[PDB]
Design a protein around this ligand. Structure first.
Ligand SMILES: OC[C@H]1O[C@H](O[C@H]2[C@H](O)[C@@H](O)[C@@H](O[C@H]3[C@H](O)[C@@H](O)[C@@H](O[C@H]4[C@H](O)[C@@H](O)[C@@H](O[C@H]5[C@H](O)[C@@H](O)[C@@H](O)O[C@@H]5CO)O[C@@H]4CO)O[C@@H]3CO)O[C@@H]2CO)[C@H](O)[C@@H](O)[C@@H]1O
Ligand SMILES: [Ca+2]
Length: 760
C-alpha cells in the first residue's frame, strides 16, 4: 500500500523546494579547454570543498592528490540560490575529483549540527573504478568513429515492437557464442559481426542471430553504474545490477578497462551504435526508484531530501531495498528528467523501462513523457505498475498537486504512451509468476483462459485485474528476468522433464505461448532466449546466481532451432496485420469471441475484422490447451474460405492449407491462425523465408519415431539440424537422408534421421 503522511521531513523539503529549487541546467561539471566549472546544489551545506586527484583510486600507478579548493555560494542579486560553484582556469580534462560536503540535514538548516561527507558528484558523467571518484571528461573524445552519423532507431508505433530483454553478460559469456575472448560478457561483444556457434561457421549467434530473428528492440538490464560487481575483481562475478551508485555513468564491469573513466563511455556507445547499425532500437532499464544504499552521493550532499522519510525518521522502504527516491521533490524530479534526456541525447538511447514505476509519482512520469516527446514522441516508455513494499509519501508534490503512484490502478491518470507490464496475460499464459509450480492456460488451466482472453486486447477492452487506456499502454509478455523462465515454469508445473531438458509436450506448450504473444495487442515482449527454450536450471531469482547459470546457452539455437523458427514466423504474422499492432482502441469492437471472454474453456477462439487496404480482411485465432485435438466452430460465420498461416508445426506468411466453413480441427496444445482466402490472394503477403523439414524414421519399418519439425530462415543463411533429443536411447541414428547442415533455399528441403536398434 501507499500512504499519504505529512511530517516535519516533508514540510522541510517543501520549504526548501519553494526557496531553493534550481533549473539552471549546469549542475556538475561544465568542461572547456580553457576552464572547468563545478556546481553543487546543497541548501543544507555550510561549505563544499573540491578535491582533485590524478587517478580514480589510490592503488593505480601515478595516483596522487593534486589539490583542494573552496566552492563559494552562488549569489543572484546578492541572494543565495542554494548552489555552490567554482571555476578552475586552464586544462583539467582527465583529472578525477570528489567533493567534501559539510552539511546539516533538511530539518536542521542554519544549525551547527553538521557532518562532513566525501562523495563523487551527484551529476557525474564519468568515474574511475567502482564509481568512488568522478572524472573530468571531454565527452566529444568518448565518441566512437561514425557516432555523429549514428541516429536513433525508433518504431513508428510502440505496439509494432518485438522486445528482447537482455543482460549484457548473459549475451556473450558463453564460449560457444563465438565472441572473442576479450569481449565475452562485455559492451564490445555487440560489435562482433559474423559470430557463429563455437566459431565453427555453420549457424549465427549474437548480433547476426538477432538480425535473423527480426527483433525490433533490445531492452538492456542495468548498464548505469551499480554497486554489486567489484570492477577490480574476478570476471566470474554476476549481478543484474539493480543497485544504483551513479545514474549517468555506464557500468564499469562491462568495459575492457574501468580504471580510465572514458573507456566505458566509448565502449557503451559502440554497443548502442552496433545495435543501431543492425536496425535495432535500444531501451534502457532505469532504476530511479532507489539507490544501493542511503550512503549515497544524494544523502551525502543533501541529507534526507532525496529519499522518502517516515515520521519516525526511518527511510520509507517501498522498493524492498532499504529506500525510495522522492520523485515528488523538485530537484529529484528534475534530476530524473534531466537524466533521461542525457541518456537519449548523449548515448542515443531510444527508450526506457522503469523499474518499480509504481514508486514513481504520475505527475513526474507524465512530465518525463512530455520532455522526451520534445525530442521525439516515438521514444518508448514502459514500466512495472507496482512497488516492492509499503510507500510513505507527502499528500502533494512539489507542484502542489495530489501525489498519485504510477501503478496499474492509476493507469487512467498516466500517459497512454507510458505502458505497464500486463501480469494478467503473463499469469494467464503460464501460471502465477510467484509460484513456479503453478499452471496457466498452456499447461491446461481452464480458469486461466480469461487471463489470456483479456490479454488478447491488451487488457484495454473491459476490466480483468487492471485496465490499460489503450494497447499503447500495455506490455504483453509471459516472462521476464524476474522469477522463472517460461520453459522452466512449463517444466516445473508439469513434471514433464528435468530443467533445461527438451520434452515434446513442453515444446508444444512453448509454441502455444508464442502464438498467444504474437496474436495479442500491446507491446510484445520476451526474455532474451524465450524463443530457444531458455532455462536458468529452475532459478526463480537469478540476480546474483552463477554467471554460467545465467548466460544464454547458444547451443540452444540448434537444440531448439524449430522453436526459434516458430517465434520468427509468429513475429512476421503480427507485423503483417494492422489490428494486432494498433496503438488505440479502433479495433476493440472488431473482435468476435466464440465464447464469452470470461469463459472457463479449453478452446479460446476469436476473429478480427481489419480495415487496412492491402492487408488481410479478417483473421481467425484459435488456442487449444486440451490434450486432444478439438473441432472448434467460430461464432463469426461471415467468412467461410480460409488460408491457415500458423499451426502446431510452423508459423509465417505462407499458406499451410485451406479450410472451407467455420469449423477448424485444432491439434492438442496448439494454435491455429487463419486469414480470409480473398484477402490472402489480394494482399500478396507471402514468405521470403525458406524451410527445412526434419523427420525421424525407424529405418526397418519406415514409421516415424517422433513428429517432424520445421526450421525456417532467410534464403542463403546457415542452418544446423540435430537428431531428436526425445527419442528413446534404445534407438540410434544409422543413416541421414538430405543435408543435416546447409543453407536455406526457397524450395523446402527435407532431412531424415534414420534410426536402428541400440542398447546404451
Ligand atoms: O521485495 C520482495 C521481493 O522483491 C522481488 O520481487 C519482485 C517479483 O519477482 C516481481 O515479479 C514483481 O512482483 C510483482 C508481481 O509480478 C505482480 O504480479 C504482483 O504480484 C501479486 C501477485 O500477482 C498475486 O498473486 C499475489 O501474490 C501472492 C502469491 O500469489 C502467493 O503465492 C504468496 O507468495 O503471496 C503473494 C503476495 O501476497 O499478490 C502479489 C502482490 O500484489 O505485484 C508484485 C509486486 O508487489 O516485483 C517484485 C518486487 O520487486 C524479489 O524478486 C523477491 O525475491 C522478493 O521476495
Ligand atoms: Ca559499478
Amino acid at each position: 500500500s501507499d500512504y499519504a503522511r505529512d511530517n516535519s521531513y516533508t514540510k522541510a523539503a517543501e520549504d526548501i523546494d519553494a526557496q531553493y529549487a534550481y533549473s539552471g541546467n549546469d549542475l556538475g561539471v561544465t568542461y572547456t579547454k580553457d576552464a572547468t566549472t563545478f556546481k553543487v546544489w546543497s541548501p543544507t551545506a555550510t561549505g563544499v570543498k573540491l578535491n582533485i586527484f590524478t587517478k580514480g583510486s589510490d592503488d593505480e600507478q601515478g595516483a596522487s592528490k593534486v589539490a583542494s579548493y573552496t566552492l563559494e555560494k552562488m549569489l543572484v542579486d546578492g541572494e543565495w540560490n542554494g548552489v555552490w560553484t567554482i571555476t578552475l582556469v586552464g586544462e583539467w580534462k582527465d583529472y578525477y575529483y570528489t567533493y567534501s560536503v559539510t552539511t546539516t540535514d533538511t530539518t536542521h538548516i542554519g544549525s551547527d549540527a553538521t557532518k562532513t561527507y566525501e562523495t563523487q558528484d551527484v551529476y557525474s558523467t564519468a568515474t574511475g573504478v567502482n564509481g568512488k571518484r568522478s572524472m573530468i571528461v571531454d565527452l566529444d573524445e568518448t565518441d566512437p568513429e561514425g557516432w555523429s552519423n549514428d541516429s536513433h532507431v525508433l518504431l513508428d508505433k510502440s505496439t509494432k515492437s518485438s522486445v528482447w530483454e537482455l543482460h549484457i553478460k548473459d549475451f556473450s559469456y558463453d564460449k560457444a557464442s563465438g565472441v572473442s575472448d576479450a569481449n565475452r560478457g562485455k559492451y564490445l561483444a555487440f560489435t562482433e559481426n559474423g559470430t557463429t556457434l563455437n566459431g565453427e561457421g555453420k549457424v549465427s549467434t549474437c548480433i547476426d542471430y538477432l538480425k535473423e530473428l527480426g527483433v525490433t528492440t533490445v531492452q538492456l538490464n542495468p548498464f548505469y553504474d551499480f554497486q554489486s560487481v567489484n570492477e577490480a575483481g574476478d570476471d566470474s562475478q554476476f549481478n543484474w545490477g539493480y543497485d544504483p551508485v551513479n545514474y549517468n555513468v555506464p557500468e564499469g564491469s562491462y568495459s575492457s578497462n574501468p580504471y580510465d573513466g572514458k573507456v566505458r563511455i566509448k565502449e557503451c556507445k559502440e554497443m548502442i551504435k552496433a545495435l543501431h547499425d543492425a536496425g535495432i532500437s535500444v531501451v534502457m532499464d532505469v532504476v530511479y526508484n532507489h539507490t544501493y544504499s542511503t550512503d549515497s552521493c544524494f544523502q551525502y550532499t543533501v541529507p534526507n531530501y532525496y529519499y522518502r522519510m517516515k515520521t519516525t525518521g526511518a527511510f520509507s522502504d517501498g522498493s524492498g531495498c532499504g529506500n525510495e527516491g522522492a520523485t515528488e521533490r523538485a530537484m529529484y524530479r528534475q534530476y530524473v528528467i534531466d537524466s533521461l534526456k542525457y541518456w537519449v541525447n548523449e548515448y542515443h538511447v531510444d527508450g526506457f523501462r522503469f523499474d518499480l514505476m509504481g514508486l514513481m509519482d504520475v505527475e513526474t512520469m507524465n512530465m518525463a513523457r512530455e520532455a522526451l516527446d520534445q525530442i521525439d514522441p516515438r521514444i518508448t516508455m514502459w514500466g512495472e505498475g507496482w512497488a516492492g513494499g509499503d510507500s510513505y509519501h507527502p499528500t502533494n508534490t512539489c507542484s502542489g498537486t495530489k501525489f498519485y503512484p504510477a501503478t496499474q490502478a492509476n493507469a487512467s491518470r498516466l500517459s497512454d504512451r507510458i505502458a505497464i507490464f500486463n501480469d494478467g496475460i503473463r499469469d494467464g499464459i503460464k501460471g502465477s509468476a510467484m509460484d513456479i509450480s503453478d499452471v496457466g492456460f498452456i499447461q491446461g488451466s481452464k480458469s486461466s483462459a480469461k487471463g489470456v482472453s483479456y490479454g488478447v486486447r491488451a487488457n484495454s477492452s473491459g476490466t480483468y485485474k487492471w485496465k490499460a487506456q489503450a494497447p499503447s499502454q500495455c506490455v504483453t509478455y509471459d516472462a521476464c528476468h524476474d522469477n522463472a523462465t517460461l520453459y522452466d515454469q512449463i517444466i516445473a508445473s508439469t513434471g514433464l522433464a528435468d530443467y533445461g531438458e527438451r520434452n515434446s509436450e513442453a515444446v508444444k506448450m512453448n509454441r502455444l505461448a508464442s502464438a498467444i504473444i504474437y496474436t495479442s495487442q500491446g507491446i510484445s515482449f520476451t526474455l532474451a532466449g524465450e524463443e530457444m527454450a531458455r532455462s536458468k536450471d529452475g532459478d526463480t531469482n537469478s540476480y546474483k546466481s552463477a554467471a554460467n547459470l545465467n548466460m544464454i546457452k547458444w547451443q540452444n539455437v540448434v537444440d531448439y532451432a524449430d522453436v526459434v523458427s516458430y517465434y520468427k514466423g509468429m513475429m512476421q504474422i503480427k507485423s503483417a496485420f494492422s489490428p494486432l499492432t494498433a496503438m488505440d482502441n479502433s479495433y476493440a469492437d472488431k473482435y468476435t469471441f466464440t465464447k464469452k471472454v470470461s469463459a472457463s474453456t479449453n478452446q479460446i477462439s476469436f476473429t478480427i475484422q481489419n480495415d487496412v487496404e492491402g492487408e488481410w480482411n479478417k483473421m481467425a485465432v484459435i488456442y487449444n490447451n486440451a490434450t486432444t485435438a478439438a473441432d472448434v466452430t467460430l461464432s463469426d460465420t461471415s467468412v467461410t474460405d480460409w488460408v491457415v498461416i500458423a499451426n502446431g508445426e510452423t508459423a509465417g506468411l505462407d499458406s499451410l492449407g485451406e479450410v472451407t466453413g467455420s469449423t477448424f480441427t485444432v491439434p492438442a496444445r496448439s494454435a491455429i491462425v487463419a486469414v480470409d482466402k480473398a484477402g490472402y490472394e489480394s494482399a500478396g503477403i507471402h514468405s521470403s523465408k525458406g524451410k527445412v523439414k526434419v523427420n525421424y524414421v525407424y529405418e526397418a519399418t519406415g514409421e516415424k519415431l517422433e513428429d517432424s519439425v520445421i526450421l525456417q530462415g532467410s534464403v542463403g543463411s546457415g542452418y544446423v539440424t540435430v537428431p531428436s533429443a526425445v527419442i528413446p536411447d534404445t534407438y540410434i541414428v544409422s543413416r541421414i537422408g538430405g543435408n543435416a547442415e546447409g543453407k536455406y533455399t526457397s524450395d523446402m528441403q527435407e532431412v531424415t534421421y534414420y534410426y536402428t536398434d541400440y542398447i546404451p
